[PDB]
Amino acid sequence: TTVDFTLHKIEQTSDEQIQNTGHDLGLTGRKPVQGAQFKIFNVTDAFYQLLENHDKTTAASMISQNLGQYVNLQDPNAATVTTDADGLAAFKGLAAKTNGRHSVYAFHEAVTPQPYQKAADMIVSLPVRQDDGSDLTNIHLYPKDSLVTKNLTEINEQAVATKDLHDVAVGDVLTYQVQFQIPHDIGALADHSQDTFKYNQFKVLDYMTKEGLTFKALTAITVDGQDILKALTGKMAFMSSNDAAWQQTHNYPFGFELDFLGGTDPDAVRNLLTQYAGKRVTVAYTGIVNEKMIPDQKVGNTAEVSFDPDSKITVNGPEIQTGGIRFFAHEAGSSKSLANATFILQRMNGNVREYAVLEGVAGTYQPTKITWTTNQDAATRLKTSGAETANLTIQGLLPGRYTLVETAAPEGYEILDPTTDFEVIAGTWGTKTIRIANTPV
Numbered sequence: 186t187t188v189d190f191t192l193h194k195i196e197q198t199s200d201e202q203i204q205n206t207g208h209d210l211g212l213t214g215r216k217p218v219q220g221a222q223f224k225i226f227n228v229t230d231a232f233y234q235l236l237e238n239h240d241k242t243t244a245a246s247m248i249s250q251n252l253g254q255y256v257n258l259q260d261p262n263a264a265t266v267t268t269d270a271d272g273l274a275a276f277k278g279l280a281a282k283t284n285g286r287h288s289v290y291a292f293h294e295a296v297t298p299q300p301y302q303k304a305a306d307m308i309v310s311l312p313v314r315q316d317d318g319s320d321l322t323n324i325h326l327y328p329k330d331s332l333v334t335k336n337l338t339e340i341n342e343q344a345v346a347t348k349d350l351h352d353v354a355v356g357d358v359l360t361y362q363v364q365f366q367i368p369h370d371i372g373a374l375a376d377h378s379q380d381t382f383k384y385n386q387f388k389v390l391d392y393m394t395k396e397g398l399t400f401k402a403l404t405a406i407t408v409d410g411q412d413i414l415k416a417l418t419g420k421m422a423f424m425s426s427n428d429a430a431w432q433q434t435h436n437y438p439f440g441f442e443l444d445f446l447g448g449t450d451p452d453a454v455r456n457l458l459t460q461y462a463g464k465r466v467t468v469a470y471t472g473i474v475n476e477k478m479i480p481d482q483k484v485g486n487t488a489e490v491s492f493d494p495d496s497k498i499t500v501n502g503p504e505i506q507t508g509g510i511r512f513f514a515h516e517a518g519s520s521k522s523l524a525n526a527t528f529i530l531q532r533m534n535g536n537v538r539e540y541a542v543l544e545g546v547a548g549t550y551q552p553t554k555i556t557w558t559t560n561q562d563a564a565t566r567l568k569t570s571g572a573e574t575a576n577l578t579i580q581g582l583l584p585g586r587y588t589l590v591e592t593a594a595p596e597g598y599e600i601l602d603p604t605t606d607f608e609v610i611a612g613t614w615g616t617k618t619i620r621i622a623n624t625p626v
Contacts, residue, residue: 187278188311189323190225190290194218194272196301197329197366200409200464207313209325217272218330221304222296224263225276226256228308229283245308249369251383252293252306254376265295281320287311297330300500302490304328305369305463331366331465335391335488335502338362338469350483351505352611355581356544356554357474358401361502363389363488364467367408372459382455384492385446389468391488392426392440397478397505400425400439401471408466413457420454422447438477439486441470476551480509480580480614506612509580510619512589514569517601517622524548524571526623527593529564530579531604532557533586540564549578566592575618584611591621598623 191209196216228248235244248255256263266274280288289310297303307328312320336347339360345351353359373383403423406414422444424430426437434442445454478484483504491497514526530541540561545552548570558564569576589605601622609615 186281188281188288188321189278190276190292190309191323191325192223192266192268192272192274192276192292193325193327194221194268194274194304195327195329197331198334198364198465201329203327205307205326207309207321207324207326209323210327213327217268217270218298218301219268219270219272220296220298221268221272221274221294221301221330222265223268223274223276223328224258224260224265224293224295225279226252226260226263226291226293227280227283227288228255228291229286229289231255232289232308232310233286241310245310248291248308249306250373251370251376252291256291258293258295267296281311292326292328294328294330300333300498301330302333302366302368302498304330333366333488333490333498333500334364335486335500336362337503337505347503349503350612351503352584353474353478353505353507354555354583355474355476355478355507355552359398359472359474359505360404360469361391361472361486362467362469363391363490363500364465365389365490365498367458367462367464367466368492369463371462372455382452384455385451386492386494387445387454387458388447388491389443389488390440390491391442391470391486392435392437393484393486394437395482395484396438397474397482397484397507398439398472399475400427400441401473403441403443404469404471406466406468408461408464411461413461413466416457417445417448417454420448420450421445439472443468474505474507474581476545476553476581478505478507478581480507480612482506483612507580508582508584508609508611509578509614510582510587510607510609511575511614512569512577512605512619512621513575514577514595514621514623516598517624522569522571522573522576523595523598523623524569524576525595526569526577526591526598526621528567528569528577529561529590529592530567531564531588531590533588543567548572548576551578551580555581569595582609584609589619589621591623594623598625600624 539557543552544554
């Protein structure tokens with residue numbers, strides 16, 4: 186006589202010990218995960234052999250921690266079903282008894298879809314008996330895939346609503362957070378080994394291919410509501426785009442590589458991680474938007490979590506972008522470029538005028554920060570070049586409505602209109618280059 190196992194693969198974004206009854210839980214209202222490949226193994230003999238020296242709990246635990254020690258994982262006979270769009274994968278018609286004992290079955294996620302981490306290898310020992318004193322013939326399991334994620338969480342230390350695209354100003358500090366799971370078997374030894382651990386690399390690589398950000402700081406590493414970073418530092422390996430090391434191995438203009446087990450004392454780290462095994466880690470860091478952040482340029486990041494050199498779990502973060510504007514100061518009635526025309530940048534703030542002060546500083550302004558004052562004389566005086574198509578450029582601005590105010594015409598000219606109202610368009614230089622005419626004398 187036989188038994189069926191129907192699996193319900195589901196997404197996990199937090200810590201959650203919830204027990205498998207084996208009973209059908211119906212509409213649980215949880216996101217299913219598709220494309221998880223599961224293999225099943227009869228471990229009844231191996232289990233009962235352990236059961237001579239160890240209790241029931243310890244036996245099942247030993248098999249979970251090193252399933253490939255007790256079975257040939259790449260067995261062609263081993264029944265394999267892949268999880269569908271509802272997260273469903275049924276293994277049917279399995280022997281209820283094996284060599285005179287109630288059967289023990291082990292389940293192993295062999296291929297885990299991106300960007301998930303695999304479920305722990307689960308062990309079921311029959312029977313699973315109903316409260317009416319009768320065995321279940323269909324056993325329902327809810328294995329969990331932990332979702333690797335990356336978000337932009339704060340801008341200038343204020344929480345922002347999460348979205349795929351953010352508008353930034355030059356000199357903004359951006360807080361990012363990468364989340365992932367400490368493996369359930371982090372502290373286990375390699376299958377058939379007394380002298381080598383199973384895990385020898387727990388790496389987080391995060392970078393941007395395009396320019397725009399300068400690495401500021403790694404702010405925290407937390408798990409289980411505890412700050413782990415103070416304990417780790419020294420014992421693990423760390424590189425940032427600010428370190429001369431970085432340009433040796435990578436050529437991304439921004440990023441960091443962290444390895445919990447690449448440091449001076451791996452084993453001490455593995456110990457600490459084992460204490461929080463199966464739980465969710467948040468690695469937080471900050472970056473500063475720099476003068477090389479340009480308009481018409483969306484720039485994102487990729488984070489890669491890897492446990493060996495040959496594999497990785499990859500996730501993309503949101504893209505950021507910035508505004509700019511171009512002007513052309515010229516002689517009324519022609520296209521003669523007028524250099525040395527003097528302007529200040531204005532905006533309204535609840536029916537009050539503020540004027541721009543640029544920290545970084547031709548006609549091309551590319552500041553490192555823009556602050557705002559109601560003292561008009563403190564405003565940065567902007568000068569035009571003699572360039573052809575546009576002779577005043579500004580970038581790193583938020584989108585919205587501004588006013589360019591001309592405070593001195595070039596020698597030999599007089600101002601037509603002192604004020605030019607305009608609009609910075611999100612992530613672009615704008616509709617067109619704005620022409621400003623000055624009349625000669």
